Amino acid sequence: MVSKGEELFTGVVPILVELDGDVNGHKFSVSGEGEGDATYGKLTLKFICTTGKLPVPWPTLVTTFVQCFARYPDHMRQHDFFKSAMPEGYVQERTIFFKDDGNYKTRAEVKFEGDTLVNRIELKGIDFKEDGNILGHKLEYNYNSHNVYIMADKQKNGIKVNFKIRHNIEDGSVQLADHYAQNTPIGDGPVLLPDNHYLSYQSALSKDPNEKRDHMVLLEFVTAAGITELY
């Protein structure tokens, strides 16, 4: 049988992203729109800085900007926490430690509003170096592929996750961003608590040639794996 949350993701779903941010007192807001196709694990999103120039590099916000759109293969359907929490949703909390620099703390509420999947985010950054790779905009506008290993936190009726992102620096080096996360359902009903597995991500960043506002176009594919003798 198909899960109630699963049913909400069988076709293409419109997405709205809203972020309010404050990094070392630099305040900004970002809106994003696009669509998700969970069957293919596909996200297509365009983000616009609605308050001017973004004070941090766009790539540092990629992980923050809807894991309910991951492709979970049929054989892993009983392990899809993110969809099972829908439509009431889930709260994602992260701390992102930039090595030799500051940290972001994020809180995201992911839920449906009608037919639209909404990702509403508050981001707070502190202890950044005003001349570091983040506030000094020294990161390349690109993105590497990463695996994210996931684990149940049954006592919290949720999941706990940690993973490392490597952002390319303009001098050929790398800026590590170490992510620690907890996801918790908003509703009081049952969710699917997964066995250990991972999500495989690939991300491509681009620009809209006709867009004059500060912005980012993101194409991202996300696939679950790591849990599998029929052959």
Domain architecture of the chain: domains with CATH: 1-231 (2.40.155.10)
User: Which resolution in angstroms does this entry have?
Assistant: 1.4
Contact 218, 205 (CB under 8 A): yes
State how far the Cα of 155 lies from the Cα of 201, in Å rounded to an integer.
28
Q: Name the experiment that determined this structure.
A: X-ray
CA dihedral (57, 60, 64, 68) positive or negative: positive
Quote the tokens at residue 92: 């994602």
Query: Residue 107: which of 171, 184, 35, 174 has the closest Cα?
Result: 184
CA dihedral (152, 64, 41, 109) positive or negative: positive
Look at residue 189 and give its three-state secondary structure: coil
- Structural gaps in the chain: residues followed by a C–N separation over 2.5 Å: 65, 228
State how far the Cα of 226 lies from the Cα of 231, in Å rounded to an integer.
17
Quote the tokens at residue 108: 């995201």
